[PDB]
Amino acid sequence: LFLX
């Protein structure tokens, strides 16, 4: 999520 950071990213993914």
Q: Which two tokens stand for residue 4?
A: 């993914």
Token representation of residue 2: 């950071």
Resolution (A): 0.8
CB count within 10 Å of CB 4 equals: 3
Q: Which two tokens stand for residue 1?
A: 């999520």
Unique residue bearing structure tokens 């999520």: 1
Which method, experimentally, gave rise to this model? X-ray
Answer left, alpha or beta for residue 2, where phi above 0 means left and psi between -120 and 50 means alpha.
beta
